[PDB]
């Protein structure tokens, strides 16, 4: 046996029992002809193939699939035709692959979700009450205070992660809970205990639907109802413990000491190795389907024998969660710091200006260009890498609708500033000090501010690119193409006046050009440089006399604002599909 323990219920659904029914649904990619009705208190497992390309049956039922469309039939939820609003208000979909933030605790993870799902009229005591009820129901009081981390591997077990993934859906008290592959990656005992947990959730006035391919013997015995499919064609719908009798009474026995789910699935499976076998097996499957439809023709249900949080509160919650998670992730912060410091020290030492012969004009200009141009190399890769790692969470959270793109947009941009500013300090200050650049507070501060704005613009560009292209490598390619274009158009490597129309237009919007020109108008503004030679004419010769320094700052701000508009439109209009 496995294990017996407390089977009490702690968090039950308080509303009227809900229903879900499907009437002659025909979906092609797909699903040929399904009819069923289930009610609160039952648990329906779906076994066999049952799906379609890149979308399971449960995604078809919730009305959010891909690569196909519903051709006929109806889906009804709580007596009403299915719609995106009924799905959002009733269906707690738990996906096969999602992630929780690595460095929050269970209490913190549930607390942040609770703040974003429960009505704004709840007091904090009521939200803490709800979180504790969910923790009690899922048997998480022991290990409630540990890390939910996946990337942080040390922490709570995979079973407990699965339970937390269920809890973040249970918090808003759903009536219909739908799970896709709940026992995936779990051990035998863990999967068994998880299925019993799902049974208790069903017991507490809820409807639970489970998509489960190839269930084990001991898991099959725990099922209340089972829907057996070979393809989109159903074979049997009804009580799991009577499934064998159904087949035995229609001429297809099953041996003792053979799992019913595996044997029947293999018996009705449609091999495509040859045309003769595929033809014979499709004919067999259609015969069994017609036979079932006849068997339950005269039997009912085809079964054999509140104000929400506003944008500001959502923003506040997202910014606190983002800052809380990333500032506990110390290895990444140390790596980013170490890379910025080592790079700034190498640039500083190469252009060292204290214990040496004073830097030439052209060496100083090369230095200022290198200070600007050599930074995006790491910034682009880490912003794109981080954005791609977060698409699963963003996609499913926006799909569920606990927040809109506005609060996420602002929280995402603002949350990197406590790391960005430290990064700018570490990168900026050792080069300005090691290479003997212009003394005084005002040059130093103007240099720092210009570098800060340019790197910010770079981050917004990479952020907009990562959210626009469907994959990591295409977004990386696009970002490097813009970076290399801006680099060449920067005006140091090639002359700005000796340009064809389109490179001139590229130079006009190149943030590395404005970075270079600004730094040059700080180091050589009104200072006399020993070559004496007036700085103003020297800047004029290189065609850097026009556009006063404040306009350079405004232009960099404008370019960042442009990429912000692109990023916002990108996220809202184009879906951030995972992987």
């Amino acid at each position, epitope marked *: 046996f496995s294990s017996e323990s407390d089977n009490s219920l702690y968090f039950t659904y308080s509303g009227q029992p809900n229903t879900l029914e499907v009437r002659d649904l025909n979906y092609q990619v797909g699903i040929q002809n399904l009819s069923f009705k289930v009610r609160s208190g039952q648990m329906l497992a779906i076994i066999g193939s049952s799906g379609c390309g890149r979308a399971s049956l449960l995604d078809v039922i919730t009305g959010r699939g891909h690569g196909g469309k519903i051709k006929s039939g109806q889906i009804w939820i709580n007596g009403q035709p299915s719609s995106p609003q009924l799905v959002r208000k009733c269906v707690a979909h738990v996906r096969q692959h999602n992630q929780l933030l690595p460095n929050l605790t269970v209490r913190e993870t549930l607390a942040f979700i609770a703040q974003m799902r429960l009505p704004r009229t709840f007091s904090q005591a009521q939200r803490d009450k709800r979180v504790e009820d969910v923790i009690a129901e899922l048997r998480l009081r022991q290990c409630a205070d540990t890390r939910v981390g996946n990337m942080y591997v040390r922490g709570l077990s995979g079973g407990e992660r699965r339970r937390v993934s269920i809890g973040v859906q249970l918090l808003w008290n759903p009536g219909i809970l739908i799970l896709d592959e709940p026992t995936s990656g779990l051990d035998s005992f863990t999967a068994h205990n998880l299925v019993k947990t799902l049974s208790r959730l069903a017991k507490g006035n809820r409807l639970v639907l489970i998509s489960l391919h190839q269930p084990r013997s001991d898991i099959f015995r725990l099922f209340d109802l089972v829907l057996l499919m070979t393809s989109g064609t159903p074979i049997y719908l009804g009580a799991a413990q009577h499934m064998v*009798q159904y087949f*035995t009474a*229609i*001429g297809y*026995p*099953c*041996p003792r*000491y053979s799992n019913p789910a595996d044997f029947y699935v293999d018996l009705t499976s449609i091999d495509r190795r040859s*045309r*003769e076998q595929e033809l014979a097996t499709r004919e067999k499957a259609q015969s069994l389907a017609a036979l079932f439809l006849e068997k339950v023709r005269d039997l009912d249900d085809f079964l054999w024998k509140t104000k929400m949080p506003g944008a500001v509160q959502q923003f506040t919650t997202l910014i606190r969660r983002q800052i809380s998670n990333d500032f506990r992730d110390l290895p990444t912060l140390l790596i980013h710091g170490a890379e910025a410091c080592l790079m700034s020290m190498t640039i500083g030492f190469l252009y060292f200006g204290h214990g040496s012969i004073q830097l030439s004009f052209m060496d100083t200009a090369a230095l200022l260009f290198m200070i600007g141009a050599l930074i995006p190399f790491n910034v682009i890769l880490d912003v794109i890498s981080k954005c791609y790692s977060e698409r699963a969470m963003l996609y499913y959270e926006l799909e569920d609708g606990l927040y809109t793109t506005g609060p996420y947009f602002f929280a995402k941009i603002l949350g990197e500033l406590p790391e960005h500013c430290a990064y700018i300090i570490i990168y900026g200050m050792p080069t300005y000090w090691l290479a003997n650049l212009r003394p005084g507070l005002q040059p130093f501060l103007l240099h720092f501010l210009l570098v800060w704005l340019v790197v910010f613009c770079c981050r917004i560009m990479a952020l907009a690119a990562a959210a626009l292209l469907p994959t990591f490598h295409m977004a990386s390619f696009f970002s490097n193409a813009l970076y290399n274009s801006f680099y060449l158009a920067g005006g140091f490597m090639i002359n700005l006046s000796s340009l064809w129309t389109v490179p001139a237009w590229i130079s006009k919007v190149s943030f590395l050009r404005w970075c270079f020109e600004g730094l040059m108008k700080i180091q050589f503004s009104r200072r006399t440089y020993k070559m004496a030679v007036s700085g103003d004419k020297i800047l004029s010769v290189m065609e850097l006399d026009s556009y006063p320094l404040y306009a350079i700052y405004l232009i960099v701000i404008g370019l960042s604002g442009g990429f912000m508009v692109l990023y916002y439109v990108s996220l809202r209009f184009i879906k951030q599909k995972p992987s």
Partner: antibody
Amino acid sequence: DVQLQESGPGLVKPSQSLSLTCTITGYSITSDYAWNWIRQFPGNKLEWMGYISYSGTTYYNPSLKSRFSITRDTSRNQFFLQFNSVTTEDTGTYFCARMITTVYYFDYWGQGTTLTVSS
Amino acid sequence: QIVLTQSPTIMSASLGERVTMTCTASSSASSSYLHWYQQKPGSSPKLWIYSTSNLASGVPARFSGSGSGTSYSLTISNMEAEDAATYYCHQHHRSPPTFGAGTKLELKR
């Protein structure tokens, strides 16, 4: 080594009852296998009649509609058949067989009995 | 409901010849559920070949069979005296299971 031995009435008249039995030894009929009856007409044509699974679930083929039933007694392990529709067309040889339920085939067969029905 | 037919109904051949028997399904059948049975006058049929190509225990390893779809066949590479029997084709692709009429081979003299 499983023995299937049929027995029952020889010559009977139509519109009577008629119960043929298959005594099975060497293997209990409460463990695996589908346990069925097969008929052969005097023209050397085999016809499958029906099975009683070890669970007690029975199945009879169509185009023999409500003509017969198959029963059994647990401890004794006899296998039974009672066709009320005792029409003269049912003359022939009957025999019981054991079905293997992984891939459906008949490995063990009995010896058979000859049933003659007429007035 | 699948009807099985067999051919030749009655055939004869001398000892040592290669002999084939054909079973045709009225629809189609999966290869795993086709079985052949051998019956001699005086007694019940015995299992001869199951799942088209797997030989039953006790058959003296000179019999074979093959097929797919709607066409299945049984072959004897070299006939002996003990092969003078009726061979029945059986399927359980779709219930109820059915039998063919059988082919009867005789020995030449």
